[PDB]
Amino acid sequence: EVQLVESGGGLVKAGGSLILSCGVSNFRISAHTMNWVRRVPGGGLEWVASISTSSTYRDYADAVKGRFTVSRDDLEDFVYLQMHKMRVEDTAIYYCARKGSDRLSDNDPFDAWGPGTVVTVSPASTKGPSVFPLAPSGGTAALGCLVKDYFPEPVTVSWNSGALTSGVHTFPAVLQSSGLYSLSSVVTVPSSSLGTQTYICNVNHKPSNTKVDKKVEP
Amino acid sequence: EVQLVESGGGLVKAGGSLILSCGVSNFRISAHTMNWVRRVPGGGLEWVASISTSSTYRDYADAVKGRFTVSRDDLEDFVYLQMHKMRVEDTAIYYCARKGSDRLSDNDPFDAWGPGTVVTVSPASTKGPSVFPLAPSTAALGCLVKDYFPEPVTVSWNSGALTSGVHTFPAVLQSSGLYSLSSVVTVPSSSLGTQTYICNVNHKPSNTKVDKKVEP
Amino acid sequence: VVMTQSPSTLSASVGDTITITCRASQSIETWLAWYQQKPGKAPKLLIYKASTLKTGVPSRFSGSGSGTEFTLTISGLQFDDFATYHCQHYAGYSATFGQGTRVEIKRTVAAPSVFIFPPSDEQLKSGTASVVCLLNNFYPREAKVQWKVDNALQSGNSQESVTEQDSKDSTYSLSSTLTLSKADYEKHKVYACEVTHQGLSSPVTKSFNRG
Amino acid sequence: VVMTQSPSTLSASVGDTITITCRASQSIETWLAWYQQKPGKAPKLLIYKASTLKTGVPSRFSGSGSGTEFTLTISGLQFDDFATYHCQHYAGYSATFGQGTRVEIKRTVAAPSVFIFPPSDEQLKSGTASVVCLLNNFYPREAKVQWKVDNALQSGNSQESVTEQDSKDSTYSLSSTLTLSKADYEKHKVYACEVTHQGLSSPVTKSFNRG
Numbered sequence: 095e096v097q098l099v100e101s102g103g104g105l106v107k108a109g110g111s112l113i114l115s116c117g118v119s120n121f122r123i124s125a126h127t128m129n130w131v132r133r134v135p136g137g138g139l140e141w142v143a144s145i146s147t148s149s150t151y152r153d154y155a156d157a158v159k160g161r162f163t164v165s166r167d168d169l170e171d172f173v174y175l176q177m178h179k180m181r182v183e184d185t186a187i188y189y190c191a192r193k194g195s196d197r198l199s200d201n202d203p204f205d206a207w208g209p210g211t212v213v214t215v216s217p218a219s220t221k222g223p224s225v226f227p228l229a230p231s232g233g234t235a236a237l238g239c240l241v242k243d244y245f246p247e248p249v250t251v252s253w254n255s256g257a258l259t260s261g262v263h264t265f266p267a268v269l270q271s272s273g274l275y276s277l278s279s280v281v282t283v284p285s286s287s288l289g290t291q292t293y294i295c296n297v298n299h300k301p302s303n304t305k306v307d308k309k310v311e312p
Numbered sequence: 313e314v315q316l317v318e319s320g321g322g323l324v325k326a327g328g329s330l331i332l333s334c335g336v337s338n339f340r341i342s343a344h345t346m347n348w349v350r351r352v353p354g355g356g357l358e359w360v361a362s363i364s365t366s367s368t369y370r371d372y373a374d375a376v377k378g379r380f381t382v383s384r385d386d387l388e389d390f391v392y393l394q395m396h397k398m399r400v401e402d403t404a405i406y407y408c409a410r411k412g413s414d415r416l417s418d419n420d421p422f423d424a425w426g427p428g429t430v431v432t433v434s435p436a437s438t439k440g441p442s443v444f445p446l447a448p449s450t451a452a453l454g455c456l457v458k459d460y461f462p463e464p465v466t467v468s469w470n471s472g473a474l475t476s477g478v479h480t481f482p483a484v485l486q487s488s489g490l491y492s493l494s495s496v497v498t499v500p501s502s503s504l505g506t507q508t509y510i511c512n513v514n515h516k517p518s519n520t521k522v523d524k525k526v527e528p
Numbered sequence: 529v530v531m532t533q534s535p536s537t538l539s540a541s542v543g544d545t546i547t548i549t550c551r552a553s554q555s556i557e558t559w560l561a562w563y564q565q566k567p568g569k570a571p572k573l574l575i576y577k578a579s580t581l582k583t584g585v586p587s588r589f590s591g592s593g594s595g596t597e598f599t600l601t602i603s604g605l606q607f608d609d610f611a612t613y614h615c616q617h618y619a620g621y622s623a624t625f626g627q628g629t630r631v632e633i634k635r636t637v638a639a640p641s642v643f644i645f646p647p648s649d650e651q652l653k654s655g656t657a658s659v660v661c662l663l664n665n666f667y668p669r670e671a672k673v674q675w676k677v678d679n680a681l682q683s684g685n686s687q688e689s690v691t692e693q694d695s696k697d698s699t700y701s702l703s704s705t706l707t708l709s710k711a712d713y714e715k716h717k718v719y720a721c722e723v724t725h726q727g728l729s730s731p732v733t734k735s736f737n738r739g
Numbered sequence: 740v741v742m743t744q745s746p747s748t749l750s751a752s753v754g755d756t757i758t759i760t761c762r763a764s765q766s767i768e769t770w771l772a773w774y775q776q777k778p779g780k781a782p783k784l785l786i787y788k789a790s791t792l793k794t795g796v797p798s799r800f801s802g803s804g805s806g807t808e809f810t811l812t813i814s815g816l817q818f819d820d821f822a823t824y825h826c827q828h829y830a831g832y833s834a835t836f837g838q839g840t841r842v843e844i845k846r847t848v849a850a851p852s853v854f855i856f857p858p859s860d861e862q863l864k865s866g867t868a869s870v871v872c873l874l875n876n877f878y879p880r881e882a883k884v885q886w887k888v889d890n891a892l893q894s895g896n897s898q899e900s901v902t903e904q905d906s907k908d909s910t911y912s913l914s915s916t917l918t919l920s921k922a923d924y925e926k927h928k929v930y931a932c933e934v935t936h937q938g939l940s941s942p943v944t945k946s947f948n949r950g
């Protein structure tokens with residue numbers, strides 16, 4: 095039996111991009127106009143995109159025109175859907191469908207569908223960090239700030255509003271399994287100043303316009 | 313002048329799939345062999361894939377052959393890289409690059425590169441659920457089956473003894489990328505002190521079985 | 529070209545004969561197809577060219593019409609036929625679908641039983657609070673759940689799912705989960721689930737105080 | 740065909756003349772290119788056909804060699820030249836790279852100052868424990884950090900990042916974060932970070948007891 099299989103769905107943040115792919119089994123796509131259709135949470139189907147044989151014609155729904163691209167690879171039988179600048183209303187199950195019939199005519203219905211792949215677009219395009227203190231040898235003590243679970247890059251960190259710059263290391267961010275970034279910023283100070291000097295890290299995440307001042311005491 | 317731009321990177325779990333795309337500016341790709349290269353955390357570059365003009369030849373590194381597919385779309389100037397059954401060592405920055413020169417020859421270097429897109433592969437291909445009780449205050453009780461991956465999860469009550477009144481709900485996908493569902497049952501309130509209620513959660517993708525008794 | 533299906537939901541019994549209409553905003557001759565879809569499955573082509581049955585489709589399905597008015601008819605509704613039906617205008621390089629018709633089993637209106645569940649202490653130790661609201665055995669399918677935390681209506685922090693129509697009593701059930709951090713959860717006292725449904729004379733609120 | 744660069748790290752000062760060698764496991768004639776790459780940027784083509792300088796590339800870069808032995812030479816190293824350099828055998832439909840040579844600023848060996856930070860109570864309330872280990876101002880760049888939880892060597896639950904070479908003193912710094920659930924964190928007592936580095940006579944262990 096003719097089969098189609100989508101690949102590439104998942105969780106996307108608003109404004110991001112995702113590319114879907116479709117492979118086939120037991121036929122060649124070369125003679126078929128190929129299509130992308132989506133089922134929205136409301137339950138209805140929306141035609142998304144169509145690419146004719148030889149890529150001669152490419153057509154898009156108005157809701158996705160300018161943001162989506164459909165492509166085909168006849169030699170290896172693949173169809174592609176690029177989705178850029180994604181909106182929450184792009185959330186749907188996406189199917190690749192073949193235009194065809196027992197005998198090919200100039201206008202056939204969608205006679206074969208893949209099982210669909212779930213694409214969900216979250217409204218939150220940015221997320222603000224949590225800031226925790228890395229609280230306090232001979233004369234040198236180290237203190238710092240853990241800037242955790244933000245998105246996207248970058249985050250800027252200063253110490254004492256810019257007064258304290260010598261000995262400051264702000265490390266390259268790290269990407270966690272949650273899809274959120276995390277970094278730390280440290281500074282070494284004379285240990286004899288831990289009881290008289292106040293230390294505040296100023297964390298600025300401009301993608302979300304978040305400013306946080308955190309005092310780091312022992 | 314000549315520009316390339318990748319798209320589609322992100323976070324994938326081991327064994328999953330991700331498709332990258334590459335667009336260009338101020339030239340057409342039709343006459344150029346197009347390539348995918350990756351920079352691994354160690355700092356070195358690894359050639360990944362190559363697709364010749366007219367897609368006549370498609371070549372892959374040994375580490376990715378059988379799992380990756382490269383495609384081209386000359387009419388709209390796009391290149392694609394399908395990555396399936398991904399491993400942790402596929403973590404890298406991925407650049408598309410054209411072979412070219414002032415005059416095109418049979419063997420030119422990579423004279424134009426895109427800025428790269430980050431692809432990260434997590435080691436955990438599956439994750440087992442946590443099971444919490446939905447304790448009763450006709451009464452209703454249940455089990456919250458949270459933070460598993462991937463689908464599906466199966467739930468029975470009392471190993472199949474309790475089937476009447478059971479509702480196991482469609483899972484929901486959270487913003488964390490992990491699935492969560494609930495399973496409830498309604499019982500006579502007068503049986504809460506004599507009947508034991510245990511939900512049996514079976515997550516075959518992780519071979520997990522969990523029994524949770526739900527007391528008032 | 530705009531396609532409009534009617535009705536959006538059709539309630540019927542096994543053995544009934546039913547008709548779903550599809551209207552085109554302008555004449556499409558007979559370039560119309562009907563698809564069937566079960567939840568979580570792919571759409572299946574039932575009828576094309578307005579009235580031609582695809583091979584394998586039972587003879588109880590029949591299509592008719594042309595121009596701007598089309599009808600799908602099921603004669604002898606069987607249990608396997610309860611599902612969503614989609615009409616589609618298809619052209620050479622584009623297509624447009626109607627909004628879909630859900631064919632469900634008819635029964636009498638039934639209000640839901642409402643229950644609320646505070647988060648378990650075991651989950652609270654993890655730093656996450658899931659408050660769960662259950663609407664049990666209601667009909668018809670449409671219901672509204674609103675969360676109130678110290679009377680502050682919530683939005684964006686809840687997810688819900690609905691069961692398929694029950695095999696025994698033909699009712700639906702709904703589960704809504706409100707997710708909060710342990711901190712935010714412990715900053716408030718009254719947690720309330722408010723349910724609006726046809727079978728209720730007024731919205732029903734079920735609540736608990738943290739404690 | 741295997742390409743091997745030498746050395747893997749090249750330490751030098753501004754104004755120096757330096758040579759990076761690239762050896763091919765078998766003859767590749769002159770099908771060899773040199774690329775420059777700065778962190779977070781794309782590679783730039785410097786030299787192709789073993790010795791042809793790309794238009795726009797300064798004449799202080801020079802490529803030479805053929806067969807199995809190739810050299811890149813920078814005469815009058817400027818600050819902008821500190822970066823990674825890659826050799827590449829390129830054929831019609833494939834390519835192979837060396838492992839890269841990082842050209843860094845030379846200085847004397849310096850052992851790191853090591854510090855350990857338990858998770859904040861504020862974060863522990865959230866259900867997550869991040870333990871942080873800091874290696875401050877060391878040289879050269881190679882360092883080894885091992886986490887031990889009640890002497891159990893850890894793997895897979897830590898991530899680290901390294902700063903670029905400091906503009907003032909030419910040292911590097913490293914941060915390693917061990918992440919655990921609050922439950923797992925409270926299942927253990929001793930948390931330790933063991934640092935191995937050339938500038939240390941023996942590994943340094945910094946530890947704390949949960950409490």
Ligand SMILES: OC[C@H]1O[C@H](O[C@@H]2[C@@H](O[C@@H]3[C@@H](O[C@@H]4[C@H](O)[C@H](O)O[C@H](CO)[C@H]4O)O[C@H](CO)[C@@H](O)[C@@H]3O)O[C@H](CO)[C@@H](O)[C@@H]2O)[C@@H](O)[C@@H](O)[C@@H]1O
Binds near residue numbers: 125126128620
């Ligand atoms: O999406 C439509 C159709 O596509 C697939 O089938 C292909 C389709 O190709 C069409 C065909 O049109 C012909 C030209 O106009 C020619 O000049 O005249 C004849 C006679 O009227 C037309 O049929 O070819 C052109 C390219 O020349 C192409 O652009 C058209 O889409 O139809 C033919 C059979 O008619 C088929 O062999 C092709 O593979 C397929 O998905 C099908 O189910 C779709 O309906």
Ligand SMILES: OC[C@H]1O[C@H](O[C@@H]2[C@@H](O[C@@H]3[C@@H](O[C@@H]4[C@H](O)[C@H](O)O[C@H](CO)[C@H]4O)O[C@H](CO)[C@@H](O)[C@@H]3O)O[C@H](CO)[C@@H](O)[C@@H]2O)[C@@H](O)[C@@H](O)[C@@H]1O
Binds near residue numbers: 368412417419832
């Ligand atoms: O990847 C190498 C090269 O690719 C792009 O440039 C293309 C390349 O095409 C080559 C050309 O081979 C010639 C023909 O087979 C001819 O029949 O015989 C001569 C005998 O010497 C071959 O050189 O064409 C074939 C397709 O038939 C193709 O597979 C070859 O790779 O080179 C030509 C110029 O030589 C160019 O016009 C093509 O576009 C481009 O990326 C380039 O920079 C790469 O180096």
